[PDB]
Amino acid sequence: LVSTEAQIQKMSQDLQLEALTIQSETQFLTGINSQAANDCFKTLIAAMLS
């Protein structure tokens, strides 16, 4: 999920050069986002430690 703001600018100026688009190798499903993977990783660890 996470990267800095300028790396989005650093990855947009070479995206048309190096075509790496299906490197992530996943089948999409409706209701799948990365902000819930980052959320469920935190409410599984922090609900165990407390």
């Binding site: 688009t21 299906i22 490197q23 190798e25």
Partner: protein
């Protein structure tokens, strides 16, 4: 003797069957090993296992 490096997508099942043809013609001591493996593993996990 310039070492090639394959690049492909795993969702393309035809690029893996046509990837069964390079490795059986071009000798595998010529592809780079980080990309010879990930193409040999793509044929294994999808086509023949």
């Amino acid at each position: 003797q310039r070492t090639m490096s394959l690049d492909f997508v795993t969702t393309n099942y035809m690029s893996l069957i046509s990837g069964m043809w390079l490795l059986t013609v071009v000798p595998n001591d010529m592809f780079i090993r980080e990309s010879l493996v990930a193409c040999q593993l793509a044929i294994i996990n999808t086509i023949i296992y």
